[PDB]
Design a protein around this nucleic acid. Structure first.
Lengths: 124, 50, 168, 19, 106, 186, 51
RNA sequence: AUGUAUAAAAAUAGAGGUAGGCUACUCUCCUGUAUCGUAGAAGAUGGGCGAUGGUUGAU
RNA sequence: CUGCCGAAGUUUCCGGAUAGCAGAAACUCAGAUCAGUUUUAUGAGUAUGUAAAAUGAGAGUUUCUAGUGGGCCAUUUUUGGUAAGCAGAACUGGCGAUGCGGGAUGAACCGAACGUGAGGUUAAGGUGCCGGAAUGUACGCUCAUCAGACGAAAAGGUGUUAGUUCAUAUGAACUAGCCCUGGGCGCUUAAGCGUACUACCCAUACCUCACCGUCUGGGUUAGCUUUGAGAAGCUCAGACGAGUAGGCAGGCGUGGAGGUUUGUGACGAAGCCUUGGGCGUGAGCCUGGGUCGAACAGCCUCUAGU
RNA sequence: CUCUGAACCUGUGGUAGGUCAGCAUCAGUUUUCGGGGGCGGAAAAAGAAUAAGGGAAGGUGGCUGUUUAUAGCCCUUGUUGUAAUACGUCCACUGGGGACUGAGGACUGCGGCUUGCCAAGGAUGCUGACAUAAUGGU
């Protein structure tokens, strides 16, 4: 089982690189006389459902796991049976007092943590 | 099914040989033998939908 | 490659005529499909016999009886042009009757910009007698002292080291 | 269907286009 | 003198392109010494590489190699199509290549 | 087939368009091409025909040297607007006559561009250097004078090489090893 | 059932399944052993060898 | 880089070489798929024999 | 934000009521009907309409309900024209809602109509170089001192090429073709023109496969140690994929409210910065580092100055 | 007594995952070279061999004219023959080379061999190196 991504480049809004007032977030071109909407040659690509990725490997990280946001130890214990499918991801607002206890708990549970070394140092 | 397949292959060989024998007889006798027109036609589309 | 096809055809029998007349034609075509189509063109063109009221009763490819002996062939054609009415007679020297027609189709296209459809060869006959030849080049080809220099052949292997001999 | 055409008294005649 | 040269010299000509569209996934390689598509059949499946150098050194070596494999002939003049592990850069047009004798079937 | 890092081409009797096309294709192959004797290039057609063709061009800089005439033909067959075609041009050196650095180097010819192998017998052709003599080039007389001087020296070297070659050729059959195992075609 | 389509003209195992007759076919059978009588009468030859 | 190897001219619809005393000769061409070069822990250590030559570096 | 449907651009009466086109619902049906179908034959005048064989598709409704209610070009037909052109109607499709290969380039020309990709093979057009692909084969034609290559134009030519025919080896009259006169570089026994035959190049087209989505057709509960019953799940199969107006469905985000997470936070909330990393087709979301200093969020529902 | 793969000593027992590569055996697709055979075609046409006959040539000998000579050719039959070859077509006949894919996930089925085995309802074996760089990303 290998994760195949149909595309890795994001879909940027048209003319988003010419103006700062126009953001990069994708907006469907409504102009009728727009070359991007009519999909000429050399025009950028647009989000189509054809680019949708495999259902089995959807939401999967490159290591094969699906991210699961964790805010406390109780969240990480839910992954006792799903440690080969999901990786714990401690939330950004969880303090360092709880990040250490989540990482130690996730170690005994056999659960990978995506950001286990954040806001802490080590002392061997 | 196997017996049916063998009978079909025997029919094809006999039908081909008899056409050859009829043409050989007409050629030797100096007459002209015209084979029957075929009822089967395989049609292929060559132009697009535009 | 052209092929000489002998096509025999006749109209289907009816109550008016118990037995129909048999028409045989010799014509050149790459495949038997073209020969049958060209043969139907001639009968309609000539006897005014409908294709739908007729049929092809015999088709036969003819090979050259003596393809290893040089011969001279006389060819008569009919030309459809801007005027739409012409007739010429030409002579070619080769070993195969089909080869003359292929060479014949070359020069009309080269000179007169003619097509296969327009030309309708009436008759091809081998001209065995030297006196009957009406073309000077064939007569020159019939002398007992035929010996001439080589026509130039203008023959990856790029960047030759030495100047080519380009001679006998 | 297949049928024979007798050539007796119905010999083929060679045809040429009119000049 | 006489080196080793267990390979065959070759040149990178262009990508598999139409008049206005290029496909850098396949490169057209001219194995010099091969002059027809029938001759190109010997070199099908052989390992072709692009050997170049970079100023920065890795593991004490300044030579980097991109490996590929000849797939099929291209044209009547013995040029072949090669697919590399990394698509060859567009600047390597006219650059030399090395066609190995392995895998071998002789 | 096989190539060389640098190639010296003798442009005596080579058609202008045919040689330029092959040279332009070789330049885009990364090869270094040096064309000598650019003033003996031949062009099919009457010398009147090419005179008016050049006169029409006279009517940018109108170069008169035969070497720069050949370079113009090669330039038009390259993507000079891009860097790839720009680098190809710098890999070509077109000169009139045979300068000393290329005097003592092998000079190959391109049979696909040779006039004898490509022009119908009796056809009128014009020489580029001869054609350029009446358009502004004024060094044809001296270029010929050096050419005969080079030919005399080159012929003397050939006689020395031929006389030396006679020694090994005579000694080739002297050694019995040649006749003993000549079964290999050597 | 039928995850992948296999060609009977290349996969002999699928051909044996589809046609329980390929095991005994005898594709090449000698017909003209030692007779080969040339069957073309002079009337046909004269018509063919015309013009 | 990977042998970073090769100097006639000339016609081509004839030239060159070879040889005689420009007149008579002969041979070759018909490309380089040629020629030179090439064997060794990329090329070791000695014993040699044989060249006593060859391959070259150094000034 | 995504996905699925998707016109018309006009009959007719006359700003309209119709209709047509496109959907929704309820009905009855596949043993019933239908068709920019082809026939057969009856007649009638090569066609014509009608009636009854082939081929394909399951068909017929009823009700109400959005938009359109301009043309351009092209084909054919056309009537008169009339310096000549043209004009006038009608006939029919394409574009108008449509990208793609070629055509030097170009919106009307030649191919081809579109999910995301790997491989293969082609169309139109091409293979001297620019340019991917034969400086291919076999015949010929053409010399221009403006060819060719992609109206003064009719003709003339001590201009040719093939020549034919007729006169007595020649000459005359003729028969045509081409030249002369009237995209770039370059090409000339072509890299020109005509013919024939092989090979080769590559489109979003065709084939095989994978993946996405939609549509359609199934299977699945004494919930069997195959455990795969969020039955709103799981599962199997095939086809399909342009799209303006418009129709429909599902999602992303914002402020506040009820509930919930026995939720996060001075061991650092929110915000902002970042060539840190990840997820989603996308709207967007998660996260590391830096900055910062007191609040804040996920889920179900409600709400709107979103 | 049973249990704790329970701590440690003694085991030197075994078995060892991620990225990138090489090969083999296969399956799906495809491309490109061959070999053998059947059948058809005027049951190829030729042709050789070949026993004759006739003829003329661009004529050998004799002498442009001439007729096998002191060279031969063409036509016809005969001729071995049931020839060979080419072409067309077919083989559920066979031998290689290359490339791209490996979807699915106990068993079911359709087949072939002989319970088992299999190229049969979609890839597995055998190895390595690097991993502590390669592979990637920006």
């Amino acid at each position: 089982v290998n994760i195949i991504k149909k595309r890795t480049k994001p879909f940027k809004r048209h003319q988003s690189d010419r103006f700062k007032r126009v953001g990069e977030s994708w907006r469907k071109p409504r102009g009728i006389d727009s070359c991007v909407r009519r999909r000429f040659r050399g025009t950028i690509s647009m989000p189509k459902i054809g680019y949708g990725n495999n259902k089995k490997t959807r939401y999967c990280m490159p290591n094969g796991l699906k991210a699961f946001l964790v805010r406390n130890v109780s969240d990480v214990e839910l992954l006792l049976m799903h440690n080969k499918t999901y990786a714990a991801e401690i939330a950004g607002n969880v303090s360092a007092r709880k990040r250490v206890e989540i990482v130690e708990k996730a170690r005994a549970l056999g659960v990978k943590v995506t950001n286990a070394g954040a806001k802490v140092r080590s002392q061997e | 099914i196997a017996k049916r397949a063998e009978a079909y292959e025997a029919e094809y060989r006999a039908a081909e040989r008899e056409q050859i024998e009829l043409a050989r007889k007409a050629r030797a006798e100096g007459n002209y033998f015209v084979p029957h027109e075929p009822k089967l036609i395989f049609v292929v589309r060559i132009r697009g939908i535009n | 490659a052209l092929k000489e096809y002998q096509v025999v055809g006749r109209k289907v029998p009816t109550e008016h005529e118990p037995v129909p007349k048999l028409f045989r034609m010799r014509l050149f075509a790459p495949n038997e499909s073209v020969a049958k189509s060209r043969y139907w063109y001639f009968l309609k063109m000539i006897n005014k016999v409908k294709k739908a009221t007729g049929e092809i009763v015999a088709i036969n490819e003819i090979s050259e009886p003596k393809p290893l002996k040089a011969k001279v062939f006389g060819i008569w054609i009919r030309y459809d042009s801007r005027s739409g009415t012409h007739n010429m007679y030409k002579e070619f020297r080769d070993t195969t009757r089909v080869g003359a027609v292929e060479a014949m189709y070359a020069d009309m296209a080269a000179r007169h910009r003619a097509r296969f459809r327009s030309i309708r060869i009436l008759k091809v006959v081998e001209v065995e007698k030297k006196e009957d030849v009406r073309r000077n080049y064939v007569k020159q080809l019939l002398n007992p002292h035929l010996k001439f220099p080589l026509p130039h052949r203008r023959t990856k292997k790029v960047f030759a080291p030495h100047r080519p001999s380009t001679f006998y | 269907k297949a049928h024979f055409v007798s050539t007796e008294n119905n010999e083929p005649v060679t045809l040429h286009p009119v000049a | 003198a006489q080196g080793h040269r267990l390979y065959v010299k070759a040149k990178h000509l262009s990508f598999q392109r139409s008049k206005h569209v290029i496909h850098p996934g396949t490169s057209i390689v001219k194995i010099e010494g091969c002059d027809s598509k029938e001759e190109a059949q010997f070199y099908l499946g052989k390992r072709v590489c692009y050997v170049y150098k970079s100023s920065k050194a890795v593991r004490g070596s300044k030579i980097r190699v991109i490996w590929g494999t000849i797939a099929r002939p291209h044209g009547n003049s013995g040029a072949v199509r090669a697919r590399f592990v990394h698509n060859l850069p567009a600047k390597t047009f006219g650059s030399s290549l090395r066609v190995m004798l392995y895998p071998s079937n002789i | 087939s096989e190539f060389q890092k640098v190639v010296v081409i003798d442009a005596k009797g080579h058609l202008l368009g045919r040689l330029a096309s092959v040279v332009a294709k070789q330049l885009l192959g990364g090869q270094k091409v040096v064309v000598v004797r650019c003033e003996e290039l031949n062009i099919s057609g009457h010398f009147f025909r090419n005179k008016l063709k050049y006169l029409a061009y006279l009517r940018a800089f109108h170069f008169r040297a035969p070497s720069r005439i050949f370079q113009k033909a090669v330039r038009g067959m390259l993507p000079h607007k891009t860097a790839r075609g720009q680098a190809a041009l710098e890999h070509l050196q077109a000169v009139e006559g045979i300068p000393p650095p290329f005097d003592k180097q092998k000079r190959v010819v391109v049979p696909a561009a040779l006039r004898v192998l490509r022009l119908k017998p009796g056809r009128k052709y014009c020489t580029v250097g001869r054609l350029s003599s009446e358009v502004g080039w004024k060094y044809n007389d001296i270029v010929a004078k050096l050419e005969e001087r080079r030919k005399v020296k080159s012929a003397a070297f050939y006689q020395a090489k031929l006389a030396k070659q006679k020694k090994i050729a005579s000694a080739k059959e002297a050694s019995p090893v040649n006749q003993k195992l000549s079964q290999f075609g050597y | 059932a039928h995850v992948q389509k296999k060609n009977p003209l290349k996969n002999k195992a699928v051909l044996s399944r589809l046609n329980p007759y390929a095991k005994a076919y005898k594709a090449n059978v000698k017909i003209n052993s030692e007779k080969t009588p040339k069957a073309a009468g002079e009337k046909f030859l004269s018509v063919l060898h015309e013009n």
